[PDB]
Amino acid sequence: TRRQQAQNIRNNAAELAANRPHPQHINNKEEYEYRRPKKDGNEPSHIANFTKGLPHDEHTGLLLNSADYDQFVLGIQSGDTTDFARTPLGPAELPKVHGCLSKQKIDCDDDHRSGFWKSQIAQGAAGGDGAKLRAWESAGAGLVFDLEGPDAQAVTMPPAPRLESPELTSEIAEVYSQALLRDIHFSQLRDPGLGDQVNACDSCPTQLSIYEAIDILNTVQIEGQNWFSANCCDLTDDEQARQRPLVTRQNIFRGIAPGDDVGPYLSQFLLIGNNALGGGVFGQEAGHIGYGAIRIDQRVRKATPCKDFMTNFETWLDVQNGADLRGLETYVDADPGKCREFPAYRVITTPRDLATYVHYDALYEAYLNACLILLGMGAPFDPGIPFQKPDVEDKQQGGPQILTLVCEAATRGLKAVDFQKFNVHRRLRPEALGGLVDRYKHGKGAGDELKPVAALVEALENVGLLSKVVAHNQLQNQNLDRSGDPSSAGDNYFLPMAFPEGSPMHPSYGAGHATVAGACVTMLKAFFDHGWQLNLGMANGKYISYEPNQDGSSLQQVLLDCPLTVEGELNKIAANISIGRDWAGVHYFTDYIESLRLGEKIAIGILEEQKLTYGENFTMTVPLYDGGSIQI
Amino acid sequence: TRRQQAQNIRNNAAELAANRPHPQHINNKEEYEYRRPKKDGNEPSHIANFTKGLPHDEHTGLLLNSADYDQFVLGIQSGDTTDFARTPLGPAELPKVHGCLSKQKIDCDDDHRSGFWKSQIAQGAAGGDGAKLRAWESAGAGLVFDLEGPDAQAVTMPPAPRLESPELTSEIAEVYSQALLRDIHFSQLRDPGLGDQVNACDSCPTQLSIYEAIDILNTVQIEGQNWFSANCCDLTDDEQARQRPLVTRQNIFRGIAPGDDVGPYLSQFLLIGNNALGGGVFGQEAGHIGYGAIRIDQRVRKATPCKDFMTNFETWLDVQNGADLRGLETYVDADPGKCREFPAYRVITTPRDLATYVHYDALYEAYLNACLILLGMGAPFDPGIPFQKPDVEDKQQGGPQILTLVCEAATRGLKAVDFQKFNVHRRLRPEALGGLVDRYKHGKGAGDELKPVAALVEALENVGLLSKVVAHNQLQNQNLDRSGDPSSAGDNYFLPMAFPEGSPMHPSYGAGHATVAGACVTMLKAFFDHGWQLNLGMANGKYISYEPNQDGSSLQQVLLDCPLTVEGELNKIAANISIGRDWAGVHYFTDYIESLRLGEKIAIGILEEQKLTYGENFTMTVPLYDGGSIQI
Amino acid sequence: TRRQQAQNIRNNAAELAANRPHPQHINNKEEYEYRRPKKDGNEPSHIANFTKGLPHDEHTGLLLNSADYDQFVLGIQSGDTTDFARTPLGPAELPKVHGCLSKQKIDCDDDHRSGFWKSQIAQGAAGGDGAKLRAWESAGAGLVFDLEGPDAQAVTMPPAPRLESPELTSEIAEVYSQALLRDIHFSQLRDPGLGDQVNACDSCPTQLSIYEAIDILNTVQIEGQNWFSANCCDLTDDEQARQRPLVTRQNIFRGIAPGDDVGPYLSQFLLIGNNALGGGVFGQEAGHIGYGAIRIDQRVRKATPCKDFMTNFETWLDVQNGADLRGLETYVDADPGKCREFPAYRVITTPRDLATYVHYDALYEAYLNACLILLGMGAPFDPGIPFQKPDVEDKQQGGPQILTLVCEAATRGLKAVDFQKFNVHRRLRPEALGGLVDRYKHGKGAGDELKPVAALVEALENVGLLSKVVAHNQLQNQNLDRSGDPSSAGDNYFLPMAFPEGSPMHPSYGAGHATVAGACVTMLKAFFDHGWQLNLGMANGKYISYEPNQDGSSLQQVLLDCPLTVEGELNKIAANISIGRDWAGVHYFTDYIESLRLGEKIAIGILEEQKLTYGENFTMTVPLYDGGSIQI
């Protein structure tokens, strides 16, 4: 009977996931490798680990005490609510006995917290009361199982690069450059041969151009070796797989995924909408997705340009001391004359607008919207699927199953990475590295604590990137909000941050956005005819695309020799959101790719388990990011 | 280890669902009860079963041949792709031998199909070629299992009413009235004491008012017994549970769910949006949901008022003969002067606009949007959940898990009902009953084929509802599109239909919308603090609500003694979409309630299975539609 | 072999209990429904939940902070000793930050605690030192399993009434009346036709009589609907089952259990003893149970009449603030002249004496004593049992097995309800509701916090019950112990309490006494010939009973048309103890009945599991409280 078959199919699906090979998780061992001097001993400095939220020394900016970090890990490893509650959080005083846990300055008894914060912004954040202290997010999310999809520890993602490696130097340099090119028009990030390029309507003091940035990444090197230039023999099988080619105007800041290089940087699905329901009142260039009978506006809230945060020591320290600064950024006010709340809201013109998109990005928003656009267009499903082709011939006739599935996959994604972030890699944030660079150039830290970073900064200084960043930060510090801060005239080398709180309160390696992106897009490519050429139009023989205006009032069309595919744009939107974090300065490149590669494994795993529920015995062809496609 | 624990938790969750009591599915036995005369015998007429798509006699309008229906069922029961492909579809010729299967008129060889259709619309539907033949949707969807949630046959929904019963007469009469009140302003559907009521800007010839409609439902009776008036003793335990009170201006067409009666008819979540991100450029009354950084417009496509379909025999017959007429309805063109594509798109003003909303309603659209509004407002989660309250105190801090869960539930919903629709109840559509009424009054059918309907029509004629419907249809037939049809001057009693194809190609009992509604809302009430009073505002002491303008340009505020709750509006939006179908004339009331009651059981079942994955050992309190709340 | 059979019978008994249907636990959802206003938000007030022990605001008397209650639940749900230890207890100060946990005033460092208490009694309780702080009892008792009997979560008891419901209003009104009739003679609680009625020897100022009280319960109504008057149709299947008839002189305060109405209120087993062992020196009217060779005195400690506690705000607040006041009540001193320590100890004359009986009632005391009386009388066992009838004929010949079984059942009882009290219903105590009434009439609470209670108090005021309670309390406050309290001249509406600490430190719904009562009596009815007519005697044709004297020196006989049965008195003693709490004002009526109905299910379950151990293959016939008897 079905009662038996139901219990079995569910039991069989559990055994499938159990029979799948379980890998062993490896890290760069940096955690306990790099050390600093204590009284009659050397201790692990944890400069190359995530330390945001823990007590940071208010003068130095380094991890205040190691015993805090050692307790912090034990709470993750033991998975105990009690152990994690003993870990000190925020500004702290050092213990009188050596090796004991730091004393937390802030508690529940503090209604006014202005005194503890060193930055003017944080001091007057909570309407004058003083900024609140935020804790670590989803610490015990990696220790939760699921009824469908592979387990969190049943899949791993290969180890992250090191400070001494040439690979990282290119990654941090790439992130720095993106911060200086955050106000650039998206039309610049592509080969000028495709169409006429434009400059952002708002004239912003730029310390770096594209042409310069391309030279930096090809020139930057450690021990006379560039990441892009290094031949296969020198690199490991891991590094070989995630190695990129020489940086080009087309492929700069673009993900290594089929169809990313083809067309403009910005995926169509983040711009275009569906044709107006029934009698077409507007075209696809309008930017209204066919959300059934209602619509979805593709315009995003415009963050007031040339406004970066965490540019000086005081601002940076306070954030790394867990100062809650969410929603302190300002946005452009609307124009009464113009319709559709412009400029207050506008089409994604510059990387800033993408950073804002991903700042409050709903988990699957980017990929749900993509599914709606394709459904409204009338895109065919991968022929292998049942109830396709004519209604008359076969007497049978789904969208419902795919729509739920893109959301299903995201959940499984977060739990897989939340283990990798915390339990395995425990990697520092790019902004947290941005600090280390400045600290070395100010000659802070005890003995040879920051000696590991010495090799990194020289390459960044030798390519002349640091010189620009210091000059760029100087102009940002003339702002009244952080001008009062003592370090304003201190030539701060800190990587500029898009959000006042910068990165979230969870480690860098494994990206929440990228893991969800890889899983959600994989599901969409599985169901849809991945190859299907988007019939957006044709103009003067060559096939038509879209990209934003200089003011972002409408979509400027771009004309391509070959048409854009569903796969190419699905891979491109996956890259956009994942790299969208890299633009804000919260993830490295390698965070994008390895999370994405893990993302599809979680997704694939679900489809293989859900395959037993269907008695049709069909096949689904899923195109992979690493070349060929897998039959399910 | 986890590898073992992972396999077990999944195996344990399967046993939980298997240990749950499995009910036995019962129907009204109407299927093979009502009979008609053949040569030297009586055969099952199947007048009280879903027959849409099968061959209907082109002169009579009845089921052409029973052998077609008997084959149709066998394909569902056997669950064989081959058997279901032999069932004849669309216009057909009768066999020369008696008891053999009908010969299908249309095939793949027909490029032009204009000749087979009797209605002018269908004849010139496919740009002059002639309307296409659509098949049955999701026939084998009820025969699919899932990794999470209870099985399709592990849960049932009690049997549907009969033609002879007084309960149905009120339900069909309620649906008829809604068709005549489809152009009514939503401000009318509430007690006038709450605020000033308005009339729809567009002046439509109305054959029925609210005041009249309220009398009809209280007056209408079978064997001198009204559905609302009948005492508990007379009714069964099933009928007792789904019994309603005497119809009131407040509770007319409103679902029996806590908070449905309270406030206006239209739920806030189908009107209001979230406050503009960052610096508030607009208010909640704007109707922009906080879809992360972008937004969702709450305005829906306006279907040109006073336009109904399937009003005459020719139009009705062709649809019941599986004529594909999707997207033949016309919509109002935009005004160049006004912003935000008005009136082309507008706020949901009249039931028509709700019918359009649910015509292309994305599965979870109504309930996802509701989740976003609550999340953007900053609504608290049911306190029982982990990582709540202060960040500092507990050192821990989800929306991601609930956002996926509302989508997860919908999928499981469709497979549960798709069994009930096809495998169990196989109930006719309200539009298909609308035909039966007309046929009896035209004196069609062989012998006492429609004798069962005789008792129904008399009550509808005795309350004077039919008289209005005939008068209402007359005006609709003066339209040029169906004026040429012979039955235009024939006093057609057919229930007017909102969509040209009317109902979908799957039986009435068990509602796709309502089953998904019940499941999706149940999930939202579980996570959110169900009681939480919405702080939409306060005006002159009394708490403030919203409802549309007469032209639907903005939101007119309504002032209530007590504030609106999250539960009340979540129950109300659940009712709106489910009843939204009843307005279009595709579902009865009982379809709304029993699907919804089944919906929460599917939802509850998932949460109980997913409970094993968490080692926190918390509790979730879920408020039920039938009074008290269940602890998970 | 037996070694195998022993392991199997035990394994088989475990599977039996596992195969029994497991219900799903539902509550009135009141917990998170009723809300109060905080700064820019609404929070769950928890006015309708058990909050005794938690911090209560010392001016208002309401729950001081919700975050305390939310922590309190999490400790129960998580079942963690650590989490429950963080919950604040007793008088507390509010936190400076909002949403954080309240600071406990008292700790281990306080030797003198007089300062924290607001009531004179509590201040000078611990011999001048100041009352101690008591904690919650048997919080983790509901999370313990057993080797015999069904599991705690394998059985549930249907949900409790609400403040808005008419059912509760009658229940609270019934409890209030009992407090005013607590000094009444037990001869009054019966139809005067049975025999001559007497008044309590001690003349007590009574604000309410029986005749008045009977009118109150029939008159009291919510929305013009009385609990006893309401027809079946209006009520739910749960309410239908626990619905009572119009209150009568016979059935007033008497449980709905076969034989409760028959005879006097007070069960014989709480008065009579066994005939003196060997040569009868005294009769059964003496009140000496045949405890083997020794005896048990049926006389109870006399609490000095007209002495009630928690009559003013200060006394009430301190108790609800967990002030330990156990054993502060005074008892009547003995008379040197009279034998058998009278009046210090006496026969149960007034409900006060029953409240004292159940104040220190040993778990099974009432039901063990009942078993001894029946055994000493020579009552026959239910014929189905082995080794019955003649010794000569059958060559075989138990009391030992039943004597242990009544004690066995009690243990299983407490663990079943302790889940319902804490984990499920979490219902407030009647005394805690008694406060809410007063608070509303003093116009305390923030905004519409107590609006829910508004409907309740009006009915109590409209029947004129409150007027008496205020007048009754005034006289009690003239006592020197609570006269100094500021609220003495404040017209206090608080329900008078029998014990200085009133109710115990565990929620109201599910009664420890009633659950044990239902289980213990069920076991006794199973073994004994339930029907057996007690041969207490015969006087002037009609059969003889007993009830106390006005001074309580002996037993006054009552003469009945039909004789009393074992079942009737076993059901009556079960009711007496359960309602004995209702007299003290610690349980509602519904607490008595639903606990009792759950009690027999726990008991029945044990007998079914223990059935496998016997190879005789006999049957036991158990008479149920809901009509017919079940064969085991």
Numbering used by the authors:
A (entry chain A), B (entry chain A), C (entry chain A): 3 to 399, 405 to 639
What does the paper say about this structure?
Vanadium-dependent haloperoxidases (VHPOs) are biotechnologically valuable and operationally versatile biocatalysts. VHPOs are categorized according to the most electronegative halide they can oxidize, leading to chloroperoxidases (VCPOs), bromoperoxidases (VBPOs), and iodoperoxidases (VIPOs). The general mechanism for VHPO-catalyzed reactions is based on the two-electron oxidation of halides. For elucidating the halogen specificity in VHPOs, we chose the vanadium-dependent haloperoxidase AmVHPO from the cyanobacterium Acaryochloris marina MBIC 1101721.
In contrast, in R425S, this section consolidated in a loop structure, strongly influenced by the introduced serine residue (highlighted in blue). The hypothesis that this loop is responsible for the halogen specificity is supported by the crystal structure analyses of the AmVHPO mutant R425D, which has no chlorination activity and lacks a structured conformation of residues 400–405. In the R425D mutant, this motif is only partially present (residue 390–400), so no interactions with 7 can occur. These molecular findings agree with the wild-type structure, in which residues 390–404 are also flexible. At the same time, no activity was measured in the presence of the wild-type enzyme or the R425D mutant. No co-crystal structure of 7 and the R425D or the wild-type enzyme could be obtained. An isosteric phosphate, obtained from the reservoir solution, replaced the cofactor vanadate in the enzyme crystals. Both mutant structures feature the identical characteristic assembly of a hexamer of dimers, arranged in a “head-to-tail” orientation with superimposable key catalytic residues when compared to the wild-type.
